[PDB]
């Protein structure tokens, strides 16, 4: 388990969920949001060493394979294995909306 | 829709499936299993550029976002999307047993 | 200097299904919402719906409530208005056009026009 | 559900002369809220003035619009040749986006 209460309470060298704000307009050109002007929808990133939260049984055979061939170039990637939705505000002419876009940040990572 | 079909086909240099043969005992040291002796489990290895196979609406911010900022280090990865299983023959003593592992194989890929 | 591109113009038969697409010149697509406005032959402008990309949430004016669908493929990076259960009335120039930014706003990027002809 | 109406149906002027076109709203519409487009014969739609008296990038200056609540006016001070055609009005105010049913401005001879 490598999330939010793990990943940010340590100096992790390896895969592990990374803080990153985005901010709506300046960084997605999204004019139409009203409220938050931004979020924290993180990433994962940092090397998968051999038994590193595998998520599938591939991802545990690619680890040990990489792990003896390193220059095979088959280790697993870091990706998010938890994300949580992200309500906001918008307005369709001037009514308030308040809906919860998905997949929107990353709580957690593992080895894929 | 990046799998066997496409990515075996044309020489692609992103994001895609590429083969891999992995040998039971020389490269698992599975001394358990009696058939097959190796089986074609794949990886995913290559570059996600923005608008490749957005596994989520995040892996689409993060594609989009990592573009105009490559110095964060933050472009969403190359990991497994389908993943099919693989029989085998293994014996307790001397009885056999065909069982179906689930997660063996890569079919398809997407960035996560 | 954004470009809007959108399909050819279509003839169908009564009753079958049109799909139009427009077509954004990357850098401004994933920022902007779009609207879809058609106009039948010497008539007024109709307010078709809309949707914002990435996000993939569209509505739609309530006159086309039930038979019109627009939807985004950022890979494409086009945006497909497809209407179904074609009518002789459906007959128009359906435009393909972005707004200023809010989903509901005025809209000062516009495609050629696509003429989407009912006939049996 | 909104409904706009342009007037006059038919506006004759000579080149040079003031062009003023209104548009009445059946509801109340902001200061920021109405819109105002040209269509030349077999084109899209050139958008001109958003909310109201907001001049659209790349628009003359002769072009000026104005108004709040329900009344909103557009108005050409010196008419040019290529002024002369279809003028809609648009409000975002209150969903579905809605038009005018247009004013034809044409050549007075």
């Known amino acids: 388990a490598l999330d939010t209460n793990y990943c940010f309470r340590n100096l992790e060298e390896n895969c592990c969920v990374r803080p990153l704000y985005i901010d709506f307009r300046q960084d997605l050109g999204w004019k139409w949001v009203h409220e938050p002007k931004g979020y924290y929808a993180n990433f994962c990133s940092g090397p998968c060493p051999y038994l590193r939260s595998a998520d599938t049984t591939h991802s545990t055979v690619l680890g040990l394979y990489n792990t003896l061939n390193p220059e095979a170039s088959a280790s697993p990637c870091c990706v998010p294995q938890d994300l949580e939705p992200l309500t906001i505000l918008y307005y369709v002419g001037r009514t308030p909306k308040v809906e919860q876009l998905s997949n929107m940040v990353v709580k957690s990572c593992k080895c894929s | 829709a990046l799998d066997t079909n496409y990515c075996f086909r044309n020489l692609e240099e992103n994001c895609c499936v590429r083969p891999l043969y992995i040998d039971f005992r020389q490269d698992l040291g599975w001394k358990w299993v009696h058939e097959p002796k190796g089986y074609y489990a794949n990886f995913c290895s290559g570059p996600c550029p923005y608008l490749r196979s957005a596994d989520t609406t995040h892996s689409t911010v993060l594609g989009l976002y990592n573009t105009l900022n490559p110095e964060a280090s933050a472009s969403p990865c190359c990991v497994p999307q389908d993943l099919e299983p693989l029989t085998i023959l293994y014996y307790v003593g001397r009885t056999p047993k065909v069982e179906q592992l689930s997660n063996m194989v890569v079919k398809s890929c997407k960035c996560s | 200097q954004v470009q809007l591109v959108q399909s050819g113009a279509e003839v169908k038969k009564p009753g079958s299904s049109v799909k139009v697409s427009c077509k954004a010149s990357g850098y401004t697509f994933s920022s902007n919402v779009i609207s879809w406005v058609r106009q039948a032959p010497g008539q007024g402008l109709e307010w078709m719906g809309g949707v914002i990309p990435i996000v993939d949430i569209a509505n739609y004016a309530q006159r086309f409530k039930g038979r019109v669908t627009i939807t985004a493929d950022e890979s494409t990076s086009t945006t497909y208005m497809e209407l179904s259960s074609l009518r002789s009335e459906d007959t128009a120039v359906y435009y393909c056009?972005?707004?200023?930014?809010?989903?509901?706003?005025?809209?000062?990027?516009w495609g050629q026009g696509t003429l989407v002809t009912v006939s049996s | 559900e909104t409904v706009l109406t342009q007037s006059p149906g038919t506006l004759s002027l000579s080149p040079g002369e003031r062009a003023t076109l209104s548009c009445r709203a059946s509801q109340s519409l902001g200061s920021s809220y109405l819109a105002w487009y040209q269509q030349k014969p077999g084109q899209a739609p050139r958008l001109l003035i958003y909310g109201a008296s907001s001049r659209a990038p790349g628009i003359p200056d002769r072009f000026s619009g104005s108004g709040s609540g329900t009344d909103f006016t557009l108005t050409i001070s010196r008419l040019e040749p290529e002024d002369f055609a279809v003028y809609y009005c648009?409000?975002?105010?209150?969903?579905?986006?809605?038009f005018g049913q247009g004013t034809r401005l044409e050549i007075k001879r």
């Open positions: 648009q409000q975002y105010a209150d969903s579905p986006i809605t």
């Open positions: 056009a972005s707004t200023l930014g809010l989903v509901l706003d005025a809209m000062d990027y």
